[PDB]
Amino acid sequence: HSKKMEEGITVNKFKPKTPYVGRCLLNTKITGDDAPGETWHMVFSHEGEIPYREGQSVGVIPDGEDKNGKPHKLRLYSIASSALGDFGDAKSVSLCVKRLIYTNDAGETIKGVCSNFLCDLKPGAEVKLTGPVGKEMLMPKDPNATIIMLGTGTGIAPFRSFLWKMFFEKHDDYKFNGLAWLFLGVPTSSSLLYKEEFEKMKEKAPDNFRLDFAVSREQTNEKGEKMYIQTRMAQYAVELWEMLKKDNTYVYMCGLKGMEKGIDDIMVSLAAAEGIDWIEYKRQLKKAEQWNVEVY
Ligand SMILES: Cc1cc2nc3c(=O)[nH]c(=O)nc-3n(C[C@H](O)[C@H](O)[C@H](O)COP(=O)(O)OP(=O)(O)OC[C@H]3O[C@@H](n4cnc5c(N)ncnc54)[C@H](O)[C@@H]3O)c2cc1C
């Protein structure tokens, strides 16, 4: 029994030993110059060979060899385009990639392998893909579901996937009529990803879509606290709490591993005020497919 759209999904049609070789169509930097670190939206051609669904991931094998002459290990990326894709023909796949740069123990700058390879791609370059992978983050079957989406940074990718399908496409068997509520936490305004597409979706389905941003370094709450995602959520504590108690409410969380703790921290308090132990309630939601997590 699934409450999610699990029927007929494809998984691992392509594998690390026999990846699908697609080509880069476009690669654009989607963060502003201010932004701490860059994020790029890149689109690849797959000619219909990767039949993915919204919520899934692909694996990427960056070109080159590891320190032992073997091929690099794959890295996973949530797909950021809906199943029809950014061109609406089902033949392309899009990624949202943050370029990883750090400094090691000796103070030397180190570029992360797959992220820099991807962010550096030029239209026409080839890229090795595996997958599709994943079941955790598939959409609910119920077209009148209340869907709450909590993302940080690149974790916006699967919710973009969802939202294109819900609001930018016409489907013969699916018409969303519920309430979708996205919270997106980023550090700067220059780090807001796809804001312009979400603003058009809001205009289109004002009654079906709610939108909240948490820009940590630029926003504060009354106490004067930094606006983190849990910080912005708390401002709607009563409402969210109420939503969580309904059977047709589904929560999805995606992004940096850290976000999980601060959210559990708000929730623990909301629940206890009600005589509810968050740890057990959360476990029951996870079991009923209502609390869906992918952090990395
Ligand atoms: C399910 C899934 C979905 C994902 N979705 C996406 C997505 O949509 N977009 C995206 O950008 N990424 C996403 N990722 C992350 C992605 O898979 C890669 O891990 C990321 O792009 C970096 O890999 P890389 O090859 O560039 O880095 P690597 O060359 O693998 O470098 C990684 C290593 O960097 C080290 N490191 C990182 N920061 C520091 C620091 N400050 N100090 C010291 N060491 C450091 C850690 O030791 C780590 O093991 C996802 C991961 C998973 C599991």
Coordinates of C-alpha atoms and ligand atoms in Angstrom, one line a residue:
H1 CA 0.0 0.0 0.0
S2 CA 1.6 3.2 -1.0
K3 CA 0.4 6.6 -0.4
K4 CA 3.0 7.7 -2.9
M5 CA 3.3 7.5 -6.6
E6 CA 5.4 4.4 -6.6
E7 CA 3.7 2.5 -9.3
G8 CA 5.7 1.7 -12.3
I9 CA 8.8 3.7 -11.2
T10 CA 12.2 2.9 -12.8
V11 CA 15.2 2.4 -10.7
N12 CA 18.8 1.8 -11.8
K13 CA 18.1 1.4 -15.4
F14 CA 21.6 2.8 -15.7
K15 CA 24.4 1.8 -13.4
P16 CA 27.9 2.8 -12.6
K17 CA 29.4 0.1 -14.8
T18 CA 27.2 1.1 -17.6
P19 CA 26.1 4.6 -17.3
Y20 CA 24.0 6.5 -19.8
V21 CA 26.0 9.1 -21.7
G22 CA 24.1 12.4 -22.1
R23 CA 25.2 15.8 -23.2
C24 CA 25.0 19.3 -21.6
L25 CA 22.5 21.6 -23.2
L26 CA 22.8 24.6 -20.9
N27 CA 24.6 25.5 -17.7
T28 CA 23.8 28.9 -16.0
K29 CA 24.9 30.4 -12.7
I30 CA 21.7 31.1 -10.8
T31 CA 23.1 32.8 -7.7
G32 CA 24.2 36.5 -7.7
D33 CA 27.7 37.7 -7.3
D34 CA 27.2 38.5 -3.7
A35 CA 26.2 34.9 -2.8
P36 CA 28.6 32.8 -0.7
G37 CA 29.4 30.2 -3.2
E38 CA 27.8 29.5 -6.6
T39 CA 24.9 27.4 -7.6
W40 CA 24.3 26.5 -11.2
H41 CA 21.2 25.1 -13.0
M42 CA 22.4 22.7 -15.8
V43 CA 20.3 20.8 -18.2
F44 CA 21.3 17.6 -19.9
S45 CA 19.8 15.7 -22.9
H46 CA 18.9 12.1 -22.3
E47 CA 16.6 11.5 -25.2
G48 CA 13.9 9.9 -23.2
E49 CA 16.2 7.1 -22.0
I50 CA 15.9 7.9 -18.4
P51 CA 12.4 7.6 -17.4
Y52 CA 12.5 9.4 -14.0
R53 CA 9.7 10.6 -11.8
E54 CA 9.5 13.8 -9.5
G55 CA 11.4 13.2 -6.2
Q56 CA 14.0 10.9 -7.7
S57 CA 17.8 11.4 -8.1
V58 CA 20.4 10.6 -10.7
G59 CA 24.0 9.6 -10.1
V60 CA 26.8 11.5 -11.9
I61 CA 30.3 10.0 -12.6
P62 CA 32.7 12.8 -12.9
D63 CA 35.4 12.3 -15.5
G64 CA 38.9 11.1 -14.4
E65 CA 40.4 8.6 -12.0
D66 CA 40.7 8.3 -8.3
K67 CA 44.1 8.2 -6.7
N68 CA 44.2 4.6 -7.6
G69 CA 43.6 4.8 -11.3
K70 CA 39.9 3.7 -10.9
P71 CA 36.9 5.7 -11.9
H72 CA 35.5 8.2 -9.5
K73 CA 32.7 7.0 -7.3
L74 CA 29.3 8.4 -8.2
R75 CA 27.8 11.4 -6.6
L76 CA 23.9 11.7 -6.3
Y77 CA 21.9 14.8 -7.2
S78 CA 18.1 15.2 -6.8
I79 CA 16.5 15.9 -10.1
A80 CA 15.4 19.5 -10.3
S81 CA 13.1 19.3 -13.3
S82 CA 9.7 17.6 -13.5
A83 CA 9.3 14.4 -15.5
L84 CA 8.5 16.3 -18.7
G85 CA 11.4 18.5 -18.0
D86 CA 12.2 22.1 -18.6
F87 CA 11.3 21.9 -22.3
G88 CA 8.2 19.9 -21.8
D89 CA 9.2 17.0 -24.0
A90 CA 10.5 14.4 -21.6
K91 CA 13.9 14.3 -23.1
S92 CA 15.9 16.5 -20.7
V93 CA 17.0 16.4 -17.0
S94 CA 18.0 19.3 -14.9
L95 CA 20.3 19.7 -11.8
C96 CA 20.8 22.3 -9.2
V97 CA 24.5 22.1 -8.1
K98 CA 26.4 24.1 -5.5
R99 CA 30.1 24.3 -6.3
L100 CA 32.1 22.9 -3.4
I101 CA 35.3 24.7 -2.4
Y102 CA 37.1 24.2 0.9
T103 CA 40.6 24.4 2.5
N104 CA 42.2 21.5 4.0
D105 CA 44.3 21.0 7.1
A106 CA 47.3 22.7 5.5
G107 CA 45.3 25.7 4.5
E108 CA 45.3 24.6 0.8
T109 CA 42.2 25.2 -1.2
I110 CA 40.4 22.1 -2.3
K111 CA 37.7 22.0 -5.0
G112 CA 35.1 19.2 -4.6
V113 CA 35.4 16.7 -7.5
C114 CA 32.0 16.2 -8.9
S115 CA 30.6 19.7 -8.1
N116 CA 33.4 21.5 -9.9
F117 CA 33.2 19.1 -12.9
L118 CA 29.5 19.7 -13.2
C119 CA 29.6 23.5 -12.7
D120 CA 32.3 23.8 -15.2
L121 CA 30.5 21.9 -18.0
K122 CA 30.1 23.6 -21.4
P123 CA 27.1 23.0 -23.7
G124 CA 28.1 20.0 -25.7
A125 CA 30.1 18.2 -23.1
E126 CA 29.1 14.6 -22.3
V127 CA 28.3 13.4 -18.9
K128 CA 27.8 10.0 -17.4
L129 CA 24.6 9.4 -15.5
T130 CA 23.2 6.6 -13.5
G131 CA 19.8 6.0 -12.0
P132 CA 17.1 7.0 -11.6
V133 CA 17.4 6.3 -7.8
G134 CA 14.9 6.7 -5.1
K135 CA 11.5 6.2 -3.6
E136 CA 11.6 8.3 -0.5
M137 CA 10.8 11.6 -2.0
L138 CA 8.0 10.6 -4.5
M139 CA 4.9 12.8 -4.5
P140 CA 1.7 11.6 -2.7
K141 CA -1.0 10.1 -4.9
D142 CA -3.7 12.3 -3.4
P143 CA -4.2 15.4 -5.7
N144 CA -5.9 17.2 -2.9
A145 CA -3.1 16.7 -0.4
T146 CA -1.6 19.3 1.9
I147 CA 2.1 19.2 1.0
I148 CA 4.6 21.1 3.1
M149 CA 8.1 21.4 1.7
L150 CA 11.0 22.4 3.7
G151 CA 14.2 23.0 1.8
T152 CA 17.6 24.5 2.4
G153 CA 19.9 25.6 -0.4
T154 CA 20.1 22.9 -3.2
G155 CA 17.5 21.1 -1.3
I156 CA 15.0 23.1 -3.3
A157 CA 15.6 20.7 -6.2
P158 CA 13.0 18.1 -5.7
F159 CA 10.4 20.7 -4.8
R160 CA 11.0 22.5 -8.0
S161 CA 10.3 19.1 -9.7
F162 CA 7.0 18.8 -7.8
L163 CA 5.9 22.3 -8.4
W164 CA 6.4 22.3 -12.1
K165 CA 4.3 19.2 -12.4
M166 CA 1.6 20.8 -10.1
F167 CA 1.5 24.2 -11.5
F168 CA 3.2 24.6 -14.8
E169 CA 1.9 21.5 -16.6
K170 CA -1.4 20.0 -17.8
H171 CA -1.8 16.2 -17.1
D172 CA -4.5 13.9 -18.2
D173 CA -4.6 12.1 -14.9
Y174 CA -3.4 14.6 -12.4
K175 CA -4.8 17.9 -11.3
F176 CA -3.5 19.3 -8.1
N177 CA -6.2 20.9 -5.9
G178 CA -4.7 20.9 -2.4
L179 CA -2.4 23.3 -0.6
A180 CA 1.3 23.3 -1.3
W181 CA 3.5 25.3 1.1
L182 CA 7.1 25.8 0.5
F183 CA 9.6 27.2 3.0
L184 CA 13.0 27.9 1.6
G185 CA 16.0 28.8 3.8
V186 CA 19.0 30.4 2.3
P187 CA 21.8 32.8 3.7
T188 CA 21.4 35.7 1.3
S189 CA 18.9 37.2 -1.1
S190 CA 21.5 36.5 -3.8
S191 CA 21.2 32.9 -2.8
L192 CA 17.4 32.6 -3.4
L193 CA 17.0 29.9 -6.0
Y194 CA 14.2 30.0 -8.6
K195 CA 12.3 32.7 -6.8
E196 CA 11.0 34.1 -10.0
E197 CA 9.4 30.8 -11.0
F198 CA 7.8 30.5 -7.6
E199 CA 6.4 34.0 -7.8
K200 CA 4.7 33.1 -11.1
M201 CA 3.2 30.0 -9.6
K202 CA 1.8 32.0 -6.7
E203 CA 0.1 34.4 -9.1
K204 CA -1.4 31.4 -10.9
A205 CA -2.7 29.4 -8.0
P206 CA -3.0 31.9 -5.2
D207 CA -5.3 29.7 -3.2
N208 CA -3.2 26.6 -3.7
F209 CA 0.3 27.7 -3.0
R210 CA 2.0 29.4 -0.1
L211 CA 5.5 30.7 -0.1
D212 CA 8.0 31.6 2.7
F213 CA 11.6 32.4 2.5
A214 CA 14.1 32.5 5.3
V215 CA 17.2 34.7 4.4
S216 CA 19.4 34.1 7.5
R217 CA 21.9 36.9 7.2
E218 CA 19.5 39.5 6.3
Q219 CA 16.4 38.8 8.2
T220 CA 15.6 38.6 11.9
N221 CA 12.6 37.9 14.1
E222 CA 11.3 40.3 16.8
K223 CA 13.8 38.9 19.4
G224 CA 16.3 39.8 16.8
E225 CA 17.1 36.2 15.9
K226 CA 18.6 35.2 12.6
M227 CA 15.9 34.0 10.2
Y228 CA 16.6 30.3 9.8
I229 CA 14.1 28.0 8.3
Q230 CA 12.9 26.8 11.7
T231 CA 12.8 30.4 12.7
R232 CA 10.5 31.3 9.9
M233 CA 8.4 28.1 10.6
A234 CA 7.8 29.1 14.2
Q235 CA 6.0 32.2 13.2
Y236 CA 3.3 29.8 11.9
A237 CA 3.5 27.2 14.7
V238 CA 0.0 27.1 15.4
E239 CA -1.0 26.6 11.8
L240 CA 1.5 24.0 11.0
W241 CA 0.8 22.1 14.0
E242 CA -2.8 22.0 13.1
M243 CA -1.9 20.8 9.6
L244 CA 0.3 18.0 10.9
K245 CA -2.6 16.5 12.7
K246 CA -4.6 15.8 9.5
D247 CA -4.2 12.6 7.7
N248 CA -3.8 14.2 4.3
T249 CA -0.8 16.3 5.2
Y250 CA 2.6 15.3 3.9
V251 CA 5.9 16.8 4.9
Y252 CA 9.0 16.7 2.8
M253 CA 12.4 17.9 3.9
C254 CA 15.4 18.3 1.7
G255 CA 18.8 19.9 1.9
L256 CA 21.7 20.1 4.4
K257 CA 21.8 17.6 7.2
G258 CA 22.0 20.3 9.7
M259 CA 18.5 21.5 9.1
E260 CA 17.0 18.5 10.6
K261 CA 18.0 19.4 14.3
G262 CA 16.7 22.9 14.5
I263 CA 13.3 21.7 13.2
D264 CA 13.0 18.9 15.6
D265 CA 13.9 21.6 18.3
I266 CA 10.9 23.7 17.3
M267 CA 8.6 20.7 17.1
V268 CA 9.6 19.2 20.3
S269 CA 8.3 22.3 22.0
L270 CA 5.2 22.5 20.0
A271 CA 4.3 19.0 20.7
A272 CA 5.0 18.9 24.4
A273 CA 2.8 21.9 24.9
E274 CA 0.1 19.6 23.8
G275 CA 1.0 16.6 25.8
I276 CA 2.7 15.0 22.8
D277 CA 6.1 13.3 22.7
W278 CA 7.6 14.6 19.3
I279 CA 9.9 11.6 19.0
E280 CA 7.0 9.2 19.0
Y281 CA 4.7 11.3 17.0
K282 CA 7.4 11.8 14.3
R283 CA 7.9 8.1 14.2
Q284 CA 4.3 7.6 13.5
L285 CA 4.3 10.1 10.8
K286 CA 7.3 8.5 9.2
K287 CA 5.5 5.2 9.3
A288 CA 2.4 6.7 7.6
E289 CA 4.5 8.2 4.9
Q290 CA 3.9 11.7 6.1
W291 CA 7.3 12.8 7.1
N292 CA 9.8 12.4 4.3
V293 CA 13.4 13.2 4.5
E294 CA 16.5 13.5 2.3
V295 CA 19.4 15.6 3.9
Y296 CA 23.0 15.3 3.0
Ligands
LIG1 C1 20.5 12.1 -2.1 C2 21.5 13.2 -2.5 C3 21.0 14.3 -3.2 C4 21.9 15.3 -3.4 N1 21.5 16.4 -4.1 C5 22.3 17.3 -4.4 C6 21.9 18.5 -5.1 O1 20.8 18.6 -5.7 N2 22.8 19.4 -5.3 C7 24.1 19.5 -4.7 O2 24.8 20.4 -4.9 N3 24.5 18.4 -4.0 C8 23.6 17.4 -3.8 N4 24.1 16.4 -3.1 C9 25.5 16.4 -2.7 C10 26.4 15.8 -3.8 O3 26.1 14.4 -3.9 C11 27.9 15.9 -3.6 O4 28.2 15.4 -2.3 C12 28.4 17.3 -3.6 O5 28.1 17.9 -4.9 C13 29.9 17.4 -3.3 O6 30.6 16.3 -3.9 P1 31.9 16.7 -4.7 O7 32.3 15.4 -5.5 O8 31.9 18.1 -5.3 O9 32.9 16.7 -3.4 P2 34.0 15.6 -2.9 O10 35.2 15.7 -3.8 O11 33.4 14.3 -2.6 O12 34.3 16.4 -1.5 C14 33.5 15.8 -0.4 C15 34.3 15.8 0.8 O13 34.5 17.3 1.1 C16 34.8 17.3 2.5 N5 34.4 18.7 3.0 C17 33.3 19.4 2.6 N6 33.3 20.6 3.1 C18 34.4 20.7 3.9 C19 34.9 21.7 4.8 N7 34.3 22.9 4.9 N8 36.0 21.3 5.4 C20 36.6 20.1 5.3 N9 36.2 19.1 4.5 C21 35.1 19.5 3.8 C22 34.2 16.1 3.2 O14 35.3 15.4 3.8 C23 33.5 15.3 2.1 O15 33.5 13.9 2.2 C24 23.2 15.3 -2.9 C25 23.7 14.2 -2.1 C26 22.8 13.2 -1.9 C27 23.1 12.0 -1.1

